[PDB]
Amino acid sequence: LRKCYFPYLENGYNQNYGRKFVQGKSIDVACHPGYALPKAQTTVTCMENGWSPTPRCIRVK
Numbered sequence: 001l002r003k004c005y006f007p008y009l010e011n012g013y014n015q016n017y018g019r020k021f022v023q024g025k026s027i028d029v030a031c032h033p034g035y036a037l038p039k040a041q042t043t044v045t046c047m048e049n050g051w052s053p054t055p056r057c058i059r060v061k
Contacts, residue, residue, distance in 0.1 A: 002049035011035045012057035021046040031057030 002023050006016040012031035021027060025046040029037060035057035036042060045052035 002047075004046035004049045004051050006051075007055060009055060009057050011059070012055070023047050023049070029055050029057070034059055034061050036060045 003020045004023065004025075006014075006019045006021070006027075008014050008017050009029065009031060012029060012035060015030065016027055019027075023046050026043045027046070028043050030042070031037070037044060037055065038053045038058065040060075041053055044055045
């Protein structure tokens with residue numbers, strides 16, 4: 001029952017970097033044009049500290 005720390009996105013806008021959220025939460029993560037999250041998502045779900053879908057901004061193109 002953790003509290004995910006929001007990490008730094010190399011190819012994304014770390015607007016939320018520095019914030020902590022409790023597991024069972026979601027939050028939007030804007031990445032640069034052509035970068036996004038898994039499952040075509042823009043939102044990450046706080047789970048077990050390590051964000052369910054993982055905020056990393058992969059290149060969609």
